[PDB]
């Protein structure tokens, strides 16, 4: 009787994903993850302790964020002992923040949090940020309270005025002030103050936070942006780099001012212009071109085919596991459905079918 429970669970899951929309979603991102390292995360209540798992999950989050969206800079400020401590400036290299987080590994989480100080200096760090960049902050929190020097509502008003959004991933339960932050910052939405139920749910939440977010019509910033593809050289001689001032065998060359750099996707240090590859911009095209869900045909009706169109395996036989791409009119197995919907980003049935 487990298949009926699985079916009704899949129905209640798919009721949320019935509506799939091609919203304009931010690509030039600006993501900040502040960390609290206080007495609360010293609890071993989840194995091994909250501090260790948020360290590991932040490592994964950095990797996933830079993989999916390499067109953003990442800054991390830790919270400790009534002080918020900047440990990671916004940068194109994830490895810097990886090393900073590795430093955060060995140190000891202790103290009390101050979202006022944390968000204030996060605002100040987010101040010299260009218009197209979408300023947004992830906040992790384990306390049920917050010691603060002054008002939080002035900070809330300033953050709303400066067009920065937040998303809170609280640990224990809901905190009303964090709900207020999420609602007021997020145009009244309640889809940003999220509480886990276990570590797997925390993993899923982090994966959810990886994704780009849609933007609002009223928050209109539709413009152009100057861009430059550089050229890579492979020279015999080591050559001084502009950024780190040291001898480099290879390195890309600046398209505009003909200097050289060491890493991409990065902006020029000399002509001060952003340099990318077409792979980097095409990386988010699945977000730009979403994929429709695939429908299982019912077991009662007559079937177009009895084996999987894509992976080429036999469909198993009570119910019918034939997920149909209505855009290509072909049914598929669950494994192929998962792979095409998540790993792949094209429908080979729609590739074979001519338009």
């Amino acid at each position: 009787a487990s298949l009926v429970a699985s079916i009704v669970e899949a129905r209640k899951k798919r009721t949320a994903k019935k509506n799939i929309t091609p919203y304009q979603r931010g690509i030039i991102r600006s993501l900040i993850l502040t960390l609290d390292c206080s007495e609360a995360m010293l609890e071993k209540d989840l194995r091994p302790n909250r501090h260790a798992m948020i360290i590991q999950y932040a490592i994964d989050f950095v990797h996933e964020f830079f993989d999916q969206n390499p067109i953003s800079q990442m800054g991390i400020i830790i919270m400790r002992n009534g002080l918020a401590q900047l440990v990671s400036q916004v940068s194109g290299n994830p490895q810097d923040h990886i090393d900073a987080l590795k430093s955060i590994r060995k140190q000891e989480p202790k103290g009390n949090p101050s979202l006022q100080n944390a968000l204030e200096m996060a605002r100040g760090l987010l101040l010299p940020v260009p218009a197209h960049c979408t300023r947004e902050v992830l906040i992790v929190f384990g306390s049920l309270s917050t010691t603060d020097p002054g008002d939080i509502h002035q900070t809330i008003d300033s953050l709303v005025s400066e067009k920065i959004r937040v998303k809170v991933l609280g640990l224990s339960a809901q905190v009303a002030i964090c709900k207020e932050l999420c609602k007021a910052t997020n145009y009244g939405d309640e889809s940003f103050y999220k509480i886990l139920l276990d570590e797997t749910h925390l993993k899923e939440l982090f994966n959810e936070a990886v994704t780009p977010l849609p933007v609002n019509k009223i928050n209109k910033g539709f413009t152009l942006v100057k861009m430059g593809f550089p050229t890579r050289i492979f020279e015999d001689t080591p050559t001084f780099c502009s950024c780190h001032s040291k001898l480099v065998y290879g390195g890309y060359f600046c398209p505009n001012c003909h200097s050289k750099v060491c890493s991409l996707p990065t902006v020029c240090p000399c002509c001060d212009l952003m340099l990318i590859l077409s792979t980097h911009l095409a990386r988010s095209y699945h977000h730009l071109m979403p994929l429709k869900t695939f429908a299982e045909v019912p077991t009662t009706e007559k079937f177009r085919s009895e084996d999987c169109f894509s992976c080429q395996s036999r469909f198993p036989i009570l119910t019918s596991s034939r997920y149909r791409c209505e855009d290509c009119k072909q049914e598929f197995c669950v494994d192929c459905d998962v792979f095409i919907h998540e790993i792949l980003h094209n429908c080979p049935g729609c590739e074979s079918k001519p338009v």
């Binding site: 040291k246 001012c257 003909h258 000399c270």
Partner: protein, 417 residues
């Protein structure tokens, strides 16, 4: 406040502060302004986010907390004092700050003072301890008892404020001023001692309430509505996102900077299906060892070329003298700084930038000549044994610099000429 570009450029003390924090910043700044004489405003003009980050790092302060509650009495007692917590006590209790400042710089020592403080009954009163005449306290600290009492009265006077009638229990109990009933129970009324006086639990409870009020008014610092208050949001319309979807019209330009026929391909197709059903031999695939030898030549040539590519797969190890290595790295660094500032001036595009562009052009020319003179030095220091490698190492930044000079000259001829 201290947030404008002008304020950040003005704070010379903060500039010196993060200067003294770094060491390569003395190196860079010394070469930039001490050695090259660049305008230090334009030096700091790039490092404005770093300056603001340093300022905001230095600028934060903690929130209030119950420091006396965190004080523990801990046989004997050994003082283990923390200066930040001492100042926390000072800020939380200006009476204790005053008692420090009129006694320690006048009469006795700081650890002696804090031993007297922990001995004092004023400490117990300010903490969550009921005062007792069995305790003797410290007389010097306990002279401040009435001063703290009148501080409490003045603070309560400040803390008084009018109350909203929506929640005013005083208005609630002033509903009926002529309630004539019976005297309520001793159990539920505030109990007293035998002689009618109170024990003082009402005093300690109003004191901790005063602590709460002081904390919330510290929050409420420098740094009608009931219609909104009584809204029942549970029976209201759900909020829906106004996020805009996006379509995509698709019309791409063809790639810019003989035709086969169905009959002919069908004829060839018929012929090759005939050949396919006719025969297929794996053994004929073996080549003629001469055109195959040319294939060997091509393959081996590709291997040699890409192997020489792979032959040049901390920086690289070099046989430079270390001092000259540092000097040339320094010259490369300051040349890069000059070039970046010149590009900042050039891409700015103002007539106000013109003298700056000219002067940085002169500085770039000077850097060019100094690079050449350095090349003369490594010339007569090596006999061009590795002075060639020195020139090649400093080459690409020089090429970019002189390209920028040519660009400046060309735009000068474009506009002026």
């Amino acid at each position: 406040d201290s947030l404008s570009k002008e304020k950040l450029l003005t704070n010379l003390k903060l500039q010196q502060s993060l200067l003294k924090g770094n060491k390569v910043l003395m190196k860079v700044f010394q070469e930039t302004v001490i050695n090259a004489g660049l305008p230090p405003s334009e030096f700091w003009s790039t490092r404005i986010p770093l300056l603001r980050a340093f300022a905001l790092s230095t600028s934060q302060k903690v929130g209030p907390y119950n420091v006396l509650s965190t004080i523990k009495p801990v046989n004997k007692v050994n003082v283990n004092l923390s200066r930040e917590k001492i100042l926390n006590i000072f800020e939380n209790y200006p009476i204790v700050k005053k008692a420090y400042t009129d006694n320690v710089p006048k009469n006795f020592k700081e650890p002696e003072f804090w031993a007297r403080f922990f001995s004092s009954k004023l400490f117990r009163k300010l903490r969550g301890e009921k005062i007792m005449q069995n305790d003797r306290g410290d007389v010097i600290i306990d002279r401040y008892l009435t001063l703290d009492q009148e501080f409490d009265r003045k603070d309560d006077d400040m803390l008084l404020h009018p109350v909203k009638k929506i929640i005013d229990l005083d208005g609630n109990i002033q509903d009926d001023p002529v309630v004539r009933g019976n005297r309520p129970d001793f159990t539920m009324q505030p109990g007293v001692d035998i002689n009618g006086n109170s024990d003082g639990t009402v005093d300690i409870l109003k004191g901790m309430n005063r602590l709460s009020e002081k904390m919330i008014m510290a929050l409420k610092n420098e740094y009608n509505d009931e219609r909104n208050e009584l809204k029942i949001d549970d029976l209201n319309e759900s909020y829906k996102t106004n996020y805009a979807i996006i379509h995509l019209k698709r019309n791409a330009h063809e790639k810019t900077t003989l035709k086969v026929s169905n009959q002919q391909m069908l004829q060839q197709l018929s012929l090759v299906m005939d050949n396919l059903i006719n025969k297929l031999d794996l053994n004929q695939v073996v080549p003629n060892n001469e055109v195959s030898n040319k294939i060997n030549k091509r393959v081996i040539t590709a291997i040699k070329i890409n192997a020489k590519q792979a032959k040049h797969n901390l920086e690289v190890k070099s046989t430079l003298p270390i001092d000259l290595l540092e000097s040339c790295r320094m010259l490369h660094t300051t040349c890069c700084e000059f070039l970046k500032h010149f590009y900042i001036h050039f891409q700015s595009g103002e007539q106000k930038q013109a003298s700056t562009v000219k002067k940085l052009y002169n500085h770039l020319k000077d850097c060019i000549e100094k690079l050449n003179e350095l090349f003369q030095d490594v010339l007569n220091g090596d006999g061009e044994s590795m002075s060639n490698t020195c020139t090649a190492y400093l080459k690409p930044v020089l090429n970019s610099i002189t390209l920028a000079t040519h660009k400046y000259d060309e735009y000068f001829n474009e506009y002026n000429n």
